[PDB]
Design a protein around this ligand. Sequence first.
Ligand SMILES: [Ca+2]
Ligand SMILES: [Ca+2]
Ligand SMILES: [Ca+2]
Ligand SMILES: [Ca+2]
Lengths: 88, 88
Amino acid sequence: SELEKAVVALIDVFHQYSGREGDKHKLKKSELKELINNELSHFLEEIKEQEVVDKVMETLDSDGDGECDFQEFMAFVAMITTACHEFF
Amino acid sequence: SELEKAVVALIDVFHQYSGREGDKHKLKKSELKELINNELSHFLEEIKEQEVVDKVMETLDSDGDGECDFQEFMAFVAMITTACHEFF
Ligand SMILES: [Ca+2]
Ligand SMILES: [Ca+2]
Ligand SMILES: [Ca+2]
Ligand SMILES: [Ca+2]
């Protein structure tokens, strides 16, 4: 279904970015930045300042290890989806 | 992008089921049941017993109003996505 296909797109997109550097199952700041700029260009403003990257990661990083793991990424998708929902 | 398209599929699918009866922005038990059986047939077992529907709703209904609103639905998608992630 469309729902099942959206679930796999979430996993696919996370894995495309998390495996580029260092830990293959987590997003460090540079991976998280490219995911936003390449895949969220219609919803979010392009990130160019280091301070914005730093702030986004602080916001998402719940277990405070400095990286975004798959749960924290899902919390981010929820925030974006919810915001979109509410706009419309 | 594939990510942006998965975000809109989440909103689209929720709205297809939440607007069938009563409150148009929430899922009551009968809407939640048909969403599962029609759209999650590859990941979840078909729901046939009332007790299973009741249990799923209790689990998802955080604000305890007996219905699944768009936030609680997003918490459900996270649980399914996460489970899929972990299986593989
Ligand atoms: Ca990584
Ligand atoms: Ca973390
Ligand atoms: Ca409804
Ligand atoms: Ca509720």
